[PDB]
Write a protein that binds this ligand. Sequence first.
Ligand SMILES: Cc1nc2c(O)cccc2c(=O)[nH]1
Ligand SMILES: [Zn+2]
Length: 199
Amino acid sequence: DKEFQSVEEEMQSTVREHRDGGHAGGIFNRYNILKIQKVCNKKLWERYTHRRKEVSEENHNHANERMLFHGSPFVNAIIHKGFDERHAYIGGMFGAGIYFAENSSKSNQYVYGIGGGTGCPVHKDRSCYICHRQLLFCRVTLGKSFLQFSAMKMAHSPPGHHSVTGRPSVNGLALAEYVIYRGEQAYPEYLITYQIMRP
Ligand SMILES: Cc1nc2c(O)cccc2c(=O)[nH]1
Ligand SMILES: [Zn+2]
């Protein structure tokens, strides 16, 4: 399939050399994609498209839809129940929102928890090349996105906006990140099962 080839391409081409030297996500340059499953949750799709239309009508008929990565130990809970802002932490860089990356390697750092947690459950390795990892390639409605460089502890989107775009800066972020404050503003379209590969 050319659809799954595009997802595989997006996943491999957006890998970057991280500042922590592979402490959180692991030491790799490439992945071994094992499976790409299309998520068909009609209840989550109706929630997404209805909010997408709302945002579109509030942003000059433009949803500002982007395909972004999301890493989390609760990926299986998200494909069934959806994204939930009620579980979001106020302590986050851009506050109590749901965070997404345009770089697959950035989202990979969150697959086993914040900062890679303790790593894989069986070997307790953040750089495990054996254990199968799971990422989400989500359809995210950004709408009128608020451009921010430094920390901004938000509870909701800034007034008149629908999301926060974290842009890279010298003292701040190394890579971009996108924050929504409503669970229905994202749809977990693809479930990617993969492994990080030894360089
Ligand atoms: C839990 C989580 N956090 C992220 C982040 O803070 C920034 C960018 C991406 C992510 C992500 O994919 N998952
Ligand atoms: Zn392992």
